Design an enzyme around this catalytic site. Structure first.
Site, mmCIF file in Angstrom:
data_model
loop_
_atom_site.group_PDB
_atom_site.id
_atom_site.type_symbol
_atom_site.label_atom_id
_atom_site.label_comp_id
_atom_site.label_asym_id
_atom_site.label_seq_id
_atom_site.Cartn_x
_atom_site.Cartn_y
_atom_site.Cartn_z
ATOM 1 N N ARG B 255 26.075 33.147 48.079
ATOM 2 C CA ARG B 255 27.140 32.205 47.744
ATOM 3 C C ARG B 255 27.985 31.859 48.964
ATOM 4 O O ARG B 255 28.228 30.680 49.248
ATOM 5 C CB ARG B 255 28.017 32.777 46.631
ATOM 6 C CG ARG B 255 29.139 31.848 46.193
ATOM 7 C CD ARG B 255 30.007 32.491 45.125
ATOM 8 N NE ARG B 255 30.707 33.670 45.626
ATOM 9 C CZ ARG B 255 31.281 34.584 44.850
ATOM 10 N NH1 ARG B 255 31.241 34.457 43.532
ATOM 11 N NH2 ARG B 255 31.897 35.624 45.394
ATOM 12 N N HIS B 327 40.208 41.437 40.253
ATOM 13 C CA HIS B 327 39.645 40.122 40.533
ATOM 14 C C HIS B 327 40.674 39.061 40.169
ATOM 15 O O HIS B 327 41.151 39.044 39.026
ATOM 16 C CB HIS B 327 38.355 39.907 39.749
ATOM 17 C CG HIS B 327 37.644 38.634 40.092
ATOM 18 N ND1 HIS B 327 37.998 37.415 39.555
ATOM 19 C CD2 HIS B 327 36.600 38.390 40.920
ATOM 20 C CE1 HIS B 327 37.203 36.476 40.035
ATOM 21 N NE2 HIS B 327 36.345 37.042 40.866
ATOM 22 N N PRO B 328 41.061 38.183 41.092
ATOM 23 C CA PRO B 328 42.122 37.214 40.789
ATOM 24 C C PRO B 328 41.731 36.306 39.632
ATOM 25 O O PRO B 328 40.668 35.682 39.639
ATOM 26 C CB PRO B 328 42.268 36.432 42.099
ATOM 27 C CG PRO B 328 41.783 37.376 43.153
ATOM 28 C CD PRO B 328 40.655 38.133 42.509
ATOM 29 N N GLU B 357 46.254 31.102 42.468
ATOM 30 C CA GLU B 357 46.422 31.558 41.092
ATOM 31 C C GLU B 357 47.602 30.866 40.421
ATOM 32 O O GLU B 357 47.532 30.518 39.237
ATOM 33 C CB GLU B 357 46.593 33.077 41.062
ATOM 34 C CG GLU B 357 45.368 33.842 41.540
ATOM 35 C CD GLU B 357 44.127 33.526 40.725
ATOM 36 O OE1 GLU B 357 44.241 33.396 39.488
ATOM 37 O OE2 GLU B 357 43.037 33.400 41.322
ATOM 38 N N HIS B 360 46.836 27.291 39.094
ATOM 39 C CA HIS B 360 46.396 27.197 37.706
ATOM 40 C C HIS B 360 47.592 27.041 36.778
ATOM 41 O O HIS B 360 47.619 26.153 35.919
ATOM 42 C CB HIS B 360 45.586 28.435 37.321
ATOM 43 C CG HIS B 360 44.382 28.669 38.181
ATOM 44 N ND1 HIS B 360 43.271 27.856 38.144
ATOM 45 C CD2 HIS B 360 44.112 29.634 39.091
ATOM 46 C CE1 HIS B 360 42.370 28.307 39.000
ATOM 47 N NE2 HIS B 360 42.857 29.384 39.589
ATOM 48 N N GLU B 384 40.041 25.300 38.999
ATOM 49 C CA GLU B 384 40.106 26.039 40.251
ATOM 50 C C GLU B 384 40.483 25.154 41.435
ATOM 51 O O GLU B 384 40.842 25.680 42.495
ATOM 52 C CB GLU B 384 38.758 26.729 40.500
ATOM 53 C CG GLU B 384 38.725 27.718 41.654
ATOM 54 C CD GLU B 384 37.370 28.383 41.814
ATOM 55 O OE1 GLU B 384 36.447 28.042 41.044
ATOM 56 O OE2 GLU B 384 37.229 29.245 42.706
ATOM 57 N N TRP B 459 12.033 26.728 42.809
ATOM 58 C CA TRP B 459 13.286 27.314 43.278
ATOM 59 C C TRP B 459 13.263 27.527 44.786
ATOM 60 O O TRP B 459 14.159 27.069 45.503
ATOM 61 C CB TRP B 459 13.553 28.633 42.550
ATOM 62 C CG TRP B 459 14.796 29.334 43.009
ATOM 63 C CD1 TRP B 459 14.866 30.427 43.822
ATOM 64 C CD2 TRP B 459 16.148 28.991 42.680
ATOM 65 N NE1 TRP B 459 16.178 30.786 44.019
ATOM 66 C CE2 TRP B 459 16.984 29.920 43.330
ATOM 67 C CE3 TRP B 459 16.732 27.988 41.899
ATOM 68 C CZ2 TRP B 459 18.373 29.876 43.223
ATOM 69 C CZ3 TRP B 459 18.111 27.947 41.795
ATOM 70 C CH2 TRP B 459 18.916 28.885 42.453
ATOM 71 N N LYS B 463 14.873 25.543 47.853
ATOM 72 C CA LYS B 463 15.770 26.342 48.679
ATOM 73 C C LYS B 463 15.532 26.092 50.162
ATOM 74 O O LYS B 463 16.487 26.032 50.944
ATOM 75 C CB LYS B 463 15.619 27.826 48.343
ATOM 76 C CG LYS B 463 16.615 28.717 49.065
ATOM 77 C CD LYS B 463 16.422 30.181 48.720
ATOM 78 C CE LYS B 463 16.806 30.450 47.273
ATOM 79 N NZ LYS B 463 16.624 31.877 46.890
ATOM 80 N N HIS B 487 27.612 33.139 36.393
ATOM 81 C CA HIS B 487 27.884 31.969 35.567
ATOM 82 C C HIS B 487 26.761 31.678 34.579
ATOM 83 O O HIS B 487 27.030 31.230 33.459
ATOM 84 C CB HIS B 487 28.128 30.747 36.453
ATOM 85 C CG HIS B 487 29.345 30.864 37.317
ATOM 86 N ND1 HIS B 487 29.344 31.543 38.516
ATOM 87 C CD2 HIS B 487 30.602 30.388 37.155
ATOM 88 C CE1 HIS B 487 30.548 31.479 39.057
ATOM 89 N NE2 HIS B 487 31.330 30.783 38.251
ATOM 90 N N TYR B 497 32.214 24.890 41.677
ATOM 91 C CA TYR B 497 32.550 25.131 43.076
ATOM 92 C C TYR B 497 32.139 23.962 43.962
ATOM 93 O O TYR B 497 32.875 23.592 44.884
ATOM 94 C CB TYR B 497 31.895 26.426 43.555
ATOM 95 C CG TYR B 497 32.408 27.660 42.846
ATOM 96 C CD1 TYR B 497 33.534 28.331 43.307
ATOM 97 C CD2 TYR B 497 31.770 28.150 41.714
ATOM 98 C CE1 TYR B 497 34.008 29.457 42.661
ATOM 99 C CE2 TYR B 497 32.237 29.276 41.061
ATOM 100 C CZ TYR B 497 33.356 29.924 41.539
ATOM 101 O OH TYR B 497 33.824 31.045 40.893
#
Lengths: 97, 597
Positions: B255, B327-328, B357, B360, B384, B459, B463, B487, B497
């Site tokens: 990620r 975790h926020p 945060e 939000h 987000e 995949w 990639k 997710h 994202y």
């Protein structure tokens, strides 16, 4: 009143009228619980399709937001009729000479 | 009488009853996450199941009010969620088994682990353990041991669970008049009933594709830059024109590249912007982090924070007895009660996460005047995104020196910005192609264009083409990479994202026009400019009651995502990567493999 009239778990004591077939006149108190009929579906005090109980209970807890906090509102109705006036403003006396 | 009047009567009464249960559902869900007790785990499940079944019971009378006879946009968008019946449109078998699939994939995700070959008695859990090892490990074998063995025990086990995940979700989408479950999240952007502002569901395929093409010139220079630095480390397994191994991406699933910044540092002799050690000198604690954050929101023109927000916030974890998730996360409860669950340490990222945060909640307080079914983000990407737009200008030297964190003797020039922009780029640039890759691959499998045997064949082919990443170990169709994602297994949107970065930079750029800042985006500081919060609050208060393209147009004036703010924000880095890549090959080739010699 959020520290008084609200409590953990919600306060259902304070209700309100959400639905009515028209608009009330000034100084008109209506306690009728009759079910509001939205459509052509008959209601006659029986819940169902387009039959909804008008009265609703405010959720009240101490954590509610400022705009959503319960507030005790006292509305003072001043009515001047043909009858003589009874309630008068304050009279503050002073020293005597 | 009319369908518009009949449905509005049902939706007005529903907003009162649903707000009471959902708030208590999120309140019990808040009390357990912050404090671990046996009473809260029961109340969280009870109140969560009551409100979940409450919408299913009321959806019987809600589905009798079609959207064609209603001319009110609000009434139609409120019934849009009530028209979907959830498990009711699915058969009794497909509905009950689907809940088992989503729960089993979450159990394997949470309880999965990979043991250390060097220490058989040490077996590290996935989170944090396997995500932490893959984060800090620079070794070739130490990363590949946990990377390949995971999908063997987990990824191969999640393949039949992913098979039901494709079929069972499509049956619900087809009952909702959607093409597939890939279109279900394409329906999150769906807009109908407004002249000229309608949004086609199939248009999203071309929307994210047209944006990814503009991300290529920024990504090709950075991908070749990281590949050139990693080439000297592993000259045998890494080609200059080839692709990077999949286990070296810096984390478990690929990620974020953020932890590769150490090798990619543009200048070792130049400082970078860090407030971590600066917060130690200014002596600010968790109580003063959100306190200094509210003053920023008041200066920019945004509403302040209520006393119940700052007093009832959860700033840390009081041990194992009452445990809070570090975790926020920002939970939206209701009735003006908004809180944030985070473990607050002293770091540069926690200050950027503070505005993240609170962003939000800054968005949550805006639409609180809307009806309950109209209380939500216009999509899953705006949640987000609104948090980050406050942290973009908060890290600027103009605001940091005004509040006292950054020393005024700090030199601000091209050398110092590129060091900070690249550190943030691996978090930003590294996410976009990988996220555009995974969701696009799901759209094809959910549609059926990819046979079951070609799942990994397409995949890894997509990639090498998209992110320029090649496998050290060739995987057949037995493995499933996306099934281990947080997710996918939990039925959440991972594409938020890719859209956030394009949403967060648009929201920031347009406010800089009112903030009187020009040039690169990172030099813009919205602090002390009141016109920033004025134009922003008008968009944040609408929610999904208006088309998301309409609210987006009210600020930037565009109906789609644009990569131009991504270019100028990294412009000092984009021009610097082009200079360093002159001796290398820009782009990548799909014909290179580490195991093919």
């Amino acid at each position: 009143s959020n520290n008084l009239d609200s409590k953990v778990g919600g306060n259902y004591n304070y209700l309100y009228r959400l639905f009515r077939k028209s608009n009330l006149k000034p100084f008109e108190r209506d306690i009728s619980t009759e079910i509001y009929q939205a459509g052509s579906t008959p209601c006659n005090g029986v819940e169902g399709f387009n039959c909804y109980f008008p009265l609703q209970s405010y959720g009240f807890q101490p954590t509610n937001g400022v705009g959503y906090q319960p507030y005790r509102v006292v509305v003072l109705s001043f009515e001047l009729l043909h009858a003589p006036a009874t309630v008068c403003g304050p009279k503050k006396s002073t020293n005597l000479v | 009488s009319t369908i518009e009047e009949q449905a509005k009567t049902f939706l007005d009464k529903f907003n009162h009853e649903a707000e009471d249960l959902f708030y208590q559902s999120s309140l019990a869900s808040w009390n357990y996450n912050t404090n671990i007790t046996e009473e809260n785990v029961q109340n969280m499940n009870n109140a969560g199941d009551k409100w979940s079944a409450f919408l299913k019971e009321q959806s019987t009378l809600a589905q009798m009010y079609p959207l064609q006879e209603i001319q009110n946009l609000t009434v139609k968008l409120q019934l849009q969620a009530l028209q979907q019946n959830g498990s009711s449109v699915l058969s009794e078998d497909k509905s009950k088994r689907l809940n088992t699939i989503l729960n089993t994939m979450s159990t394997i995700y949470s309880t999965g682990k990979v043991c250390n070959p060097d220490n058989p008695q040490e077996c590290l859990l996935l989170e944090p353990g396997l995500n932490e090892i893959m984060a800090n490990s620079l070794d070739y074998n130490e990363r590949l041991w946990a990377w390949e063995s995971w999908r063997s025990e987990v990824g191969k086990q999640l393949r039949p669970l992913y098979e039901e995940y494709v079929v069972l979700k499509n049956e619900m989408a087809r009952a909702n008049h959607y093409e597939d479950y890939g279109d279900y999240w394409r329906g999150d952007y769906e807009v109908n009933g407004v002249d000229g502002y309608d949004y086609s569901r199939g248009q999203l395929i071309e929307d994210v594709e047209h944006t990814f093409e503009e991300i290529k010139p920024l990504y090709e220079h950075l991908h070749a830059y990281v590949r050139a630095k990693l080439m000297n480390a592993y000259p045998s397994y890494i080609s200059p024109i080839g692709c990077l191994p999949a286990h070296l991406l810096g984390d478990m699933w690929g990620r974020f590249w953020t932890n590769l910044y150490s090798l990619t540092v543009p200048f070792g002799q130049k400082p970078n912007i860090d407030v971590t050690d600066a917060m130690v000198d200014q002596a600010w604690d968790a109580q003063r982090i959100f306190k200094e954050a509210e003053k920023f929101f008041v200066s920019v023109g945004l509403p302040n924070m209520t006393q119940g927000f700052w007093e009832n916030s959860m700033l840390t974890d009081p041990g194992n007895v009452q445990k809070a998730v570090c975790h926020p996360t920002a939970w939206d409860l209701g009735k003006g009660d908004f809180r944030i669950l985070m473990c607050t340490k002293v770091t540069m990222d926690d200050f950027l996460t503070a505005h993240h945060e609170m962003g939000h909640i800054q968005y949550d307080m805006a639409y609180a005047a809307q009806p309950f079914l109209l209380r939500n983000g216009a999509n899953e990407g705006f949640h987000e995104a609104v948090g980050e737009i406050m942290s973009l200008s908060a890290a600027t030297p103009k605001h940091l020196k005004s509040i006292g964190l950054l020393s005024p003797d700090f030199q601000e020039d091209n050398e110092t910005e590129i060091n900070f922009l690249l550190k943030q780029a691996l978090t930003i640039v590294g996410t976009l192609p990988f996220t555009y890759m995974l969701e696009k691959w799901r759209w094809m499998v959910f549609k059926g264009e990819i046979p079951k045997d070609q799942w990994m064949k397409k995949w890894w082919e997509m990639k090498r083409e998209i992110v320029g990443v090649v496998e050290p170990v060739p995987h057949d169709e037995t493995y499933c990479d996306p099934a281990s994602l947080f997710h996918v297994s939990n039925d959440y949107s991972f594409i938020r994202y890719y859209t956030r970065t394009l949403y967060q930079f648009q929201f920031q750029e347009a406010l800089c026009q009112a903030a009187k800042h020009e040039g690169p985006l990172h030099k813009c500081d919205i602090s002390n400019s009141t016109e920033a919060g004025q134009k922003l609050f008008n968009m944040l208060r609408l929610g999904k009651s208006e088309p998301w393209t309409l609210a987006l147009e009210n600020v930037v004036g565009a109906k789609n995502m644009n990569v131009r703010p991504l270019l100028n924000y990294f412009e000092p880095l984009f021009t610097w990567l082009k200079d360093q890549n002159k001796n290398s090959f820009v782009g990548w080739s799909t014909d290179w493999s580490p195991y093919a010699d």
